[PDB]
PDB file of all heavy atoms in Angstrom:
ATOM      1  N   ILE A 210     136.999   0.718 109.123  1.00  0.00           N
ATOM      2  CA  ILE A 210     135.553   0.668 108.952  1.00  0.00           C
ATOM      3  C   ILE A 210     135.207  -0.463 107.994  1.00  0.00           C
ATOM      4  O   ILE A 210     136.026  -0.893 107.180  1.00  0.00           O
ATOM      5  CB  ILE A 210     134.977   2.001 108.429  1.00  0.00           C
ATOM      6  CG1 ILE A 210     135.778   2.489 107.221  1.00  0.00           C
ATOM      7  CG2 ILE A 210     134.971   3.047 109.528  1.00  0.00           C
ATOM      8  CD1 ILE A 210     135.049   3.508 106.378  1.00  0.00           C
ATOM      9  N   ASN A 211     133.969  -0.945 108.102  1.00  0.00           N
ATOM     10  CA  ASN A 211     133.497  -2.018 107.235  1.00  0.00           C
ATOM     11  C   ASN A 211     132.158  -1.669 106.599  1.00  0.00           C
ATOM     12  O   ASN A 211     131.861  -2.110 105.484  1.00  0.00           O
ATOM     13  CB  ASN A 211     133.384  -3.327 108.019  1.00  0.00           C
ATOM     14  CG  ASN A 211     132.368  -3.248 109.140  1.00  0.00           C
ATOM     15  OD1 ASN A 211     132.279  -2.241 109.843  1.00  0.00           O
ATOM     16  ND2 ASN A 211     131.592  -4.312 109.312  1.00  0.00           N
ATOM     17  N   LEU A 212     131.344  -0.884 107.298  1.00  0.00           N
ATOM     18  CA  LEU A 212     130.017  -0.549 106.803  1.00  0.00           C
ATOM     19  C   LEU A 212     130.102   0.441 105.644  1.00  0.00           C
ATOM     20  O   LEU A 212     131.076   1.184 105.490  1.00  0.00           O
ATOM     21  CB  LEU A 212     129.155   0.028 107.926  1.00  0.00           C
ATOM     22  CG  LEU A 212     128.226  -0.961 108.635  1.00  0.00           C
ATOM     23  CD1 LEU A 212     129.007  -1.849 109.591  1.00  0.00           C
ATOM     24  CD2 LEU A 212     127.115  -0.224 109.368  1.00  0.00           C
ATOM     25  N   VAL A 213     129.056   0.434 104.815  1.00  0.00           N
ATOM     26  CA  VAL A 213     129.004   1.338 103.669  1.00  0.00           C
ATOM     27  C   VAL A 213     128.962   2.787 104.133  1.00  0.00           C
ATOM     28  O   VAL A 213     129.658   3.651 103.586  1.00  0.00           O
ATOM     29  CB  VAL A 213     127.801   0.994 102.771  1.00  0.00           C
ATOM     30  CG1 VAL A 213     127.683   1.997 101.631  1.00  0.00           C
ATOM     31  CG2 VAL A 213     127.931  -0.422 102.231  1.00  0.00           C
ATOM     32  N   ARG A 214     128.143   3.079 105.144  1.00  0.00           N
ATOM     33  CA  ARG A 214     128.077   4.432 105.678  1.00  0.00           C
ATOM     34  C   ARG A 214     129.425   4.832 106.262  1.00  0.00           C
ATOM     35  O   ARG A 214     130.054   4.071 107.003  1.00  0.00           O
ATOM     36  CB  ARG A 214     126.982   4.532 106.741  1.00  0.00           C
ATOM     37  CG  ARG A 214     125.582   4.684 106.163  1.00  0.00           C
ATOM     38  CD  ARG A 214     124.621   5.294 107.171  1.00  0.00           C
ATOM     39  NE  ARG A 214     123.279   5.444 106.619  1.00  0.00           N
ATOM     40  CZ  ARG A 214     122.269   6.026 107.251  1.00  0.00           C
ATOM     41  NH1 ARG A 214     122.412   6.533 108.464  1.00  0.00           N
ATOM     42  NH2 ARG A 214     121.085   6.101 106.650  1.00  0.00           N
ATOM     43  N   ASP A 215     129.870   6.041 105.917  1.00  0.00           N
ATOM     44  CA  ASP A 215     131.235   6.449 106.233  1.00  0.00           C
ATOM     45  C   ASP A 215     131.436   6.642 107.732  1.00  0.00           C
ATOM     46  O   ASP A 215     132.491   6.287 108.271  1.00  0.00           O
ATOM     47  CB  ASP A 215     131.583   7.725 105.471  1.00  0.00           C
ATOM     48  CG  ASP A 215     131.318   7.602 103.983  1.00  0.00           C
ATOM     49  OD1 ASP A 215     131.233   6.460 103.486  1.00  0.00           O
ATOM     50  OD2 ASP A 215     131.191   8.645 103.310  1.00  0.00           O
ATOM     51  N   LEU A 216     130.441   7.196 108.423  1.00  0.00           N
ATOM     52  CA  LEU A 216     130.565   7.430 109.854  1.00  0.00           C
ATOM     53  C   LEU A 216     129.773   6.368 110.603  1.00  0.00           C
ATOM     54  O   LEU A 216     128.535   6.424 110.624  1.00  0.00           O
ATOM     55  CB  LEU A 216     130.069   8.832 110.216  1.00  0.00           C
ATOM     56  CG  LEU A 216     130.849   9.969 109.550  1.00  0.00           C
ATOM     57  CD1 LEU A 216     130.414  11.320 110.087  1.00  0.00           C
ATOM     58  CD2 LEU A 216     132.343   9.774 109.742  1.00  0.00           C
ATOM     59  N   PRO A 217     130.427   5.391 111.229  1.00  0.00           N
ATOM     60  CA  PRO A 217     129.690   4.292 111.863  1.00  0.00           C
ATOM     61  C   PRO A 217     129.347   4.564 113.318  1.00  0.00           C
ATOM     62  O   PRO A 217     129.709   5.607 113.871  1.00  0.00           O
ATOM     63  CB  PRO A 217     130.653   3.106 111.730  1.00  0.00           C
ATOM     64  CG  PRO A 217     132.031   3.726 111.546  1.00  0.00           C
ATOM     65  CD  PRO A 217     131.882   5.215 111.352  1.00  0.00           C
ATOM     66  N   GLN A 218     128.646   3.617 113.946  1.00  0.00           N
ATOM     67  CA  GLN A 218     128.223   3.787 115.330  1.00  0.00           C
ATOM     68  C   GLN A 218     129.367   3.598 116.316  1.00  0.00           C
ATOM     69  O   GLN A 218     129.233   3.985 117.481  1.00  0.00           O
ATOM     70  CB  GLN A 218     127.093   2.810 115.664  1.00  0.00           C
ATOM     71  CG  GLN A 218     125.727   3.208 115.120  1.00  0.00           C
ATOM     72  CD  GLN A 218     125.681   3.230 113.604  1.00  0.00           C
ATOM     73  OE1 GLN A 218     125.551   2.188 112.961  1.00  0.00           O
ATOM     74  NE2 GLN A 218     125.802   4.418 113.023  1.00  0.00           N
ATOM     75  N   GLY A 219     130.477   3.000 115.886  1.00  0.00           N
ATOM     76  CA  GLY A 219     131.617   2.792 116.756  1.00  0.00           C
ATOM     77  C   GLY A 219     132.216   4.081 117.279  1.00  0.00           C
ATOM     78  O   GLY A 219     132.484   5.006 116.508  1.00  0.00           O
ATOM     79  N   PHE A 220     132.432   4.155 118.589  1.00  0.00           N
ATOM     80  CA  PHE A 220     132.974   5.344 119.231  1.00  0.00           C
ATOM     81  C   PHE A 220     134.430   5.104 119.607  1.00  0.00           C
ATOM     82  O   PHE A 220     134.758   4.078 120.214  1.00  0.00           O
ATOM     83  CB  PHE A 220     132.166   5.714 120.475  1.00  0.00           C
ATOM     84  CG  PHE A 220     132.825   6.751 121.332  1.00  0.00           C
ATOM     85  CD1 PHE A 220     132.865   8.073 120.929  1.00  0.00           C
ATOM     86  CD2 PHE A 220     133.412   6.405 122.535  1.00  0.00           C
ATOM     87  CE1 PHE A 220     133.474   9.030 121.712  1.00  0.00           C
ATOM     88  CE2 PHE A 220     134.023   7.359 123.321  1.00  0.00           C
ATOM     89  CZ  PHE A 220     134.052   8.674 122.908  1.00  0.00           C
ATOM     90  N   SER A 221     135.294   6.049 119.248  1.00  0.00           N
ATOM     91  CA  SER A 221     136.716   5.959 119.542  1.00  0.00           C
ATOM     92  C   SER A 221     137.256   7.347 119.846  1.00  0.00           C
ATOM     93  O   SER A 221     136.838   8.332 119.231  1.00  0.00           O
ATOM     94  CB  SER A 221     137.491   5.338 118.375  1.00  0.00           C
ATOM     95  OG  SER A 221     137.615   6.257 117.303  1.00  0.00           O
ATOM     96  N   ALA A 222     138.189   7.417 120.791  1.00  0.00           N
ATOM     97  CA  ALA A 222     138.763   8.692 121.187  1.00  0.00           C
ATOM     98  C   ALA A 222     139.675   9.233 120.089  1.00  0.00           C
ATOM     99  O   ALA A 222     140.026   8.540 119.130  1.00  0.00           O
ATOM    100  CB  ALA A 222     139.534   8.549 122.497  1.00  0.00           C
ATOM    101  N   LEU A 223     140.062  10.496 120.240  1.00  0.00           N
ATOM    102  CA  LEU A 223     140.931  11.177 119.291  1.00  0.00           C
ATOM    103  C   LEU A 223     142.202  11.608 120.005  1.00  0.00           C
ATOM    104  O   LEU A 223     142.138  12.287 121.034  1.00  0.00           O
ATOM    105  CB  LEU A 223     140.229  12.388 118.675  1.00  0.00           C
ATOM    106  CG  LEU A 223     139.800  12.243 117.216  1.00  0.00           C
ATOM    107  CD1 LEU A 223     138.963  10.990 117.036  1.00  0.00           C
ATOM    108  CD2 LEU A 223     139.030  13.467 116.762  1.00  0.00           C
ATOM    109  N   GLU A 224     143.355  11.222 119.453  1.00  0.00           N
ATOM    110  CA  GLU A 224     144.604  11.520 120.132  1.00  0.00           C
ATOM    111  C   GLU A 224     145.291  12.727 119.505  1.00  0.00           C
ATOM    112  O   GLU A 224     145.229  12.922 118.289  1.00  0.00           O
ATOM    113  CB  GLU A 224     145.546  10.313 120.077  1.00  0.00           C
ATOM    114  CG  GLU A 224     145.151   9.179 121.009  1.00  0.00           C
ATOM    115  CD  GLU A 224     145.724   7.841 120.582  1.00  0.00           C
ATOM    116  OE1 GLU A 224     145.546   7.464 119.404  1.00  0.00           O
ATOM    117  OE2 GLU A 224     146.348   7.165 121.424  1.00  0.00           O
ATOM    118  N   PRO A 225     145.942  13.557 120.318  1.00  0.00           N
ATOM    119  CA  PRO A 225     146.665  14.710 119.770  1.00  0.00           C
ATOM    120  C   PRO A 225     147.808  14.273 118.867  1.00  0.00           C
ATOM    121  O   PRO A 225     148.448  13.244 119.090  1.00  0.00           O
ATOM    122  CB  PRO A 225     147.186  15.433 121.017  1.00  0.00           C
ATOM    123  CG  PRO A 225     146.330  14.942 122.136  1.00  0.00           C
ATOM    124  CD  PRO A 225     145.966  13.536 121.789  1.00  0.00           C
ATOM    125  N   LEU A 226     148.054  15.072 117.830  1.00  0.00           N
ATOM    126  CA  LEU A 226     149.130  14.796 116.886  1.00  0.00           C
ATOM    127  C   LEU A 226     150.209  15.869 116.923  1.00  0.00           C
ATOM    128  O   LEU A 226     151.374  15.555 117.184  1.00  0.00           O
ATOM    129  CB  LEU A 226     148.557  14.656 115.470  1.00  0.00           C
ATOM    130  CG  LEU A 226     149.320  13.754 114.501  1.00  0.00           C
ATOM    131  CD1 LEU A 226     149.604  12.404 115.136  1.00  0.00           C
ATOM    132  CD2 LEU A 226     148.536  13.586 113.213  1.00  0.00           C
ATOM    133  N   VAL A 227     149.852  17.130 116.689  1.00  0.00           N
ATOM    134  CA  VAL A 227     150.813  18.228 116.639  1.00  0.00           C
ATOM    135  C   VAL A 227     150.122  19.493 117.126  1.00  0.00           C
ATOM    136  O   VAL A 227     148.979  19.770 116.755  1.00  0.00           O
ATOM    137  CB  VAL A 227     151.381  18.421 115.213  1.00  0.00           C
ATOM    138  CG1 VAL A 227     151.947  19.822 115.043  1.00  0.00           C
ATOM    139  CG2 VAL A 227     152.458  17.389 114.910  1.00  0.00           C
ATOM    140  N   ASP A 228     150.817  20.256 117.964  1.00  0.00           N
ATOM    141  CA  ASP A 228     150.377  21.582 118.365  1.00  0.00           C
ATOM    142  C   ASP A 228     151.290  22.629 117.741  1.00  0.00           C
ATOM    143  O   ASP A 228     152.495  22.414 117.588  1.00  0.00           O
ATOM    144  CB  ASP A 228     150.361  21.726 119.892  1.00  0.00           C
ATOM    145  CG  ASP A 228     151.711  22.117 120.458  1.00  0.00           C
ATOM    146  OD1 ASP A 228     152.680  21.352 120.269  1.00  0.00           O
ATOM    147  OD2 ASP A 228     151.802  23.189 121.093  1.00  0.00           O
ATOM    148  N   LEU A 229     150.702  23.761 117.361  1.00  0.00           N
ATOM    149  CA  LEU A 229     151.425  24.810 116.647  1.00  0.00           C
ATOM    150  C   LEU A 229     151.262  26.130 117.385  1.00  0.00           C
ATOM    151  O   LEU A 229     150.120  26.596 117.573  1.00  0.00           O
ATOM    152  CB  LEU A 229     150.927  24.926 115.206  1.00  0.00           C
ATOM    153  CG  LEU A 229     151.249  23.732 114.311  1.00  0.00           C
ATOM    154  CD1 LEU A 229     150.766  23.984 112.895  1.00  0.00           C
ATOM    155  CD2 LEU A 229     152.739  23.439 114.330  1.00  0.00           C
ATOM    156  N   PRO A 230     152.348  26.762 117.825  1.00  0.00           N
ATOM    157  CA  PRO A 230     152.258  28.069 118.495  1.00  0.00           C
ATOM    158  C   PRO A 230     152.369  29.236 117.514  1.00  0.00           C
ATOM    159  O   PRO A 230     153.299  30.046 117.571  1.00  0.00           O
ATOM    160  CB  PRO A 230     153.438  28.011 119.472  1.00  0.00           C
ATOM    161  CG  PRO A 230     154.463  27.177 118.755  1.00  0.00           C
ATOM    162  CD  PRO A 230     153.729  26.246 117.810  1.00  0.00           C
ATOM    163  N   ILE A 231     151.405  29.329 116.600  1.00  0.00           N
ATOM    164  CA  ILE A 231     151.369  30.385 115.594  1.00  0.00           C
ATOM    165  C   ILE A 231     150.215  31.321 115.921  1.00  0.00           C
ATOM    166  O   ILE A 231     149.059  30.888 116.011  1.00  0.00           O
ATOM    167  CB  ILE A 231     151.232  29.816 114.173  1.00  0.00           C
ATOM    168  CG1 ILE A 231     150.222  28.667 114.144  1.00  0.00           C
ATOM    169  CG2 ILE A 231     152.579  29.356 113.654  1.00  0.00           C
ATOM    170  CD1 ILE A 231     149.801  28.266 112.751  1.00  0.00           C
ATOM    171  N   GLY A 232     150.525  32.602 116.097  1.00  0.00           N
ATOM    172  CA  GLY A 232     149.495  33.588 116.351  1.00  0.00           C
ATOM    173  C   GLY A 232     149.026  34.276 115.087  1.00  0.00           C
ATOM    174  O   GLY A 232     149.655  35.230 114.621  1.00  0.00           O
ATOM    175  N   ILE A 233     147.919  33.800 114.524  1.00  0.00           N
ATOM    176  CA  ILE A 233     147.346  34.366 113.311  1.00  0.00           C
ATOM    177  C   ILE A 233     145.831  34.349 113.438  1.00  0.00           C
ATOM    178  O   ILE A 233     145.251  33.375 113.931  1.00  0.00           O
ATOM    179  CB  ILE A 233     147.795  33.596 112.051  1.00  0.00           C
ATOM    180  CG1 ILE A 233     147.860  32.094 112.338  1.00  0.00           C
ATOM    181  CG2 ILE A 233     149.139  34.111 111.561  1.00  0.00           C
ATOM    182  CD1 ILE A 233     148.211  31.256 111.127  1.00  0.00           C
ATOM    183  N   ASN A 234     145.189  35.428 112.998  1.00  0.00           N
ATOM    184  CA  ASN A 234     143.733  35.484 112.996  1.00  0.00           C
ATOM    185  C   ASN A 234     143.191  34.494 111.973  1.00  0.00           C
ATOM    186  O   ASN A 234     143.490  34.599 110.779  1.00  0.00           O
ATOM    187  CB  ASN A 234     143.256  36.899 112.686  1.00  0.00           C
ATOM    188  CG  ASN A 234     142.547  37.546 113.861  1.00  0.00           C
ATOM    189  OD1 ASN A 234     141.706  36.926 114.511  1.00  0.00           O
ATOM    190  ND2 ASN A 234     142.883  38.801 114.137  1.00  0.00           N
ATOM    191  N   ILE A 235     142.396  33.535 112.437  1.00  0.00           N
ATOM    192  CA  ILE A 235     141.858  32.477 111.590  1.00  0.00           C
ATOM    193  C   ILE A 235     140.340  32.523 111.678  1.00  0.00           C
ATOM    194  O   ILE A 235     139.774  32.396 112.771  1.00  0.00           O
ATOM    195  CB  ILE A 235     142.381  31.090 112.000  1.00  0.00           C
ATOM    196  CG1 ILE A 235     143.890  31.000 111.763  1.00  0.00           C
ATOM    197  CG2 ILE A 235     141.644  29.999 111.240  1.00  0.00           C
ATOM    198  CD1 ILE A 235     144.270  30.631 110.348  1.00  0.00           C
ATOM    199  N   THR A 236     139.684  32.709 110.535  1.00  0.00           N
ATOM    200  CA  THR A 236     138.229  32.702 110.464  1.00  0.00           C
ATOM    201  C   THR A 236     137.678  31.912 109.286  1.00  0.00           C
ATOM    202  O   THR A 236     136.485  31.583 109.295  1.00  0.00           O
ATOM    203  CB  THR A 236     137.691  34.140 110.391  1.00  0.00           C
ATOM    204  OG1 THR A 236     138.526  35.002 111.174  1.00  0.00           O
ATOM    205  CG2 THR A 236     136.271  34.213 110.935  1.00  0.00           C
ATOM    206  N   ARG A 237     138.495  31.582 108.290  1.00  0.00           N
ATOM    207  CA  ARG A 237     138.048  30.861 107.110  1.00  0.00           C
ATOM    208  C   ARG A 237     139.051  29.763 106.792  1.00  0.00           C
ATOM    209  O   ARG A 237     140.256  29.929 106.996  1.00  0.00           O
ATOM    210  CB  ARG A 237     137.895  31.806 105.912  1.00  0.00           C
ATOM    211  CG  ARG A 237     137.046  31.269 104.774  1.00  0.00           C
ATOM    212  CD  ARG A 237     137.909  30.690 103.661  1.00  0.00           C
ATOM    213  NE  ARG A 237     138.598  31.718 102.886  1.00  0.00           N
ATOM    214  CZ  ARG A 237     138.003  32.601 102.094  1.00  0.00           C
ATOM    215  NH1 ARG A 237     136.691  32.616 101.934  1.00  0.00           N
ATOM    216  NH2 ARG A 237     138.747  33.490 101.443  1.00  0.00           N
ATOM    217  N   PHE A 238     138.548  28.635 106.298  1.00  0.00           N
ATOM    218  CA  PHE A 238     139.418  27.544 105.886  1.00  0.00           C
ATOM    219  C   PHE A 238     138.858  26.910 104.623  1.00  0.00           C
ATOM    220  O   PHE A 238     137.655  26.967 104.360  1.00  0.00           O
ATOM    221  CB  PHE A 238     139.584  26.489 106.993  1.00  0.00           C
ATOM    222  CG  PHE A 238     138.602  25.350 106.919  1.00  0.00           C
ATOM    223  CD1 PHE A 238     138.939  24.171 106.268  1.00  0.00           C
ATOM    224  CD2 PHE A 238     137.355  25.449 107.507  1.00  0.00           C
ATOM    225  CE1 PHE A 238     138.051  23.119 106.201  1.00  0.00           C
ATOM    226  CE2 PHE A 238     136.459  24.398 107.441  1.00  0.00           C
ATOM    227  CZ  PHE A 238     136.809  23.232 106.788  1.00  0.00           C
ATOM    228  N   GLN A 239     139.748  26.305 103.842  1.00  0.00           N
ATOM    229  CA  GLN A 239     139.379  25.661 102.592  1.00  0.00           C
ATOM    230  C   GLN A 239     140.178  24.378 102.436  1.00  0.00           C
ATOM    231  O   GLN A 239     141.385  24.356 102.690  1.00  0.00           O
ATOM    232  CB  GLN A 239     139.626  26.589 101.396  1.00  0.00           C
ATOM    233  CG  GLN A 239     139.002  26.112 100.099  1.00  0.00           C
ATOM    234  CD  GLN A 239     138.922  27.206  99.055  1.00  0.00           C
ATOM    235  OE1 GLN A 239     137.834  27.601  98.637  1.00  0.00           O
ATOM    236  NE2 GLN A 239     140.076  27.702  98.626  1.00  0.00           N
ATOM    237  N   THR A 240     139.503  23.312 102.020  1.00  0.00           N
ATOM    238  CA  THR A 240     140.168  22.033 101.841  1.00  0.00           C
ATOM    239  C   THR A 240     140.861  21.972 100.482  1.00  0.00           C
ATOM    240  O   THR A 240     140.599  22.774  99.583  1.00  0.00           O
ATOM    241  CB  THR A 240     139.172  20.883 101.970  1.00  0.00           C
ATOM    242  OG1 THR A 240     138.273  20.904 100.856  1.00  0.00           O
ATOM    243  CG2 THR A 240     138.376  21.025 103.254  1.00  0.00           C
TER     244      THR A 240
END
């Protein structure tokens, strides 16, 4: 990126990285 605004108008696809076969109830997340 070059613009000051973090999310620019440029559109780009998203590629898969890792899949996880874990069966757990997920409803909350924290960074």
Side-chain angles (χ1 to χ4, degrees):
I210 49 161
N211 63 319
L212 264 76
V213 176
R214 280 202 180 185
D215 307 340
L216 299 187
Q218 283 64 80
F220 168 73
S221 74
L223 252 53
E224 286 158 308
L226 208 50
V227 159
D228 85 300
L229 292 183
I231 42 167
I233 38 176
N234 246 315
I235 295 276
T236 325
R237 198 261 287 293
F238 92 95
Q239 192 164 243
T240 69

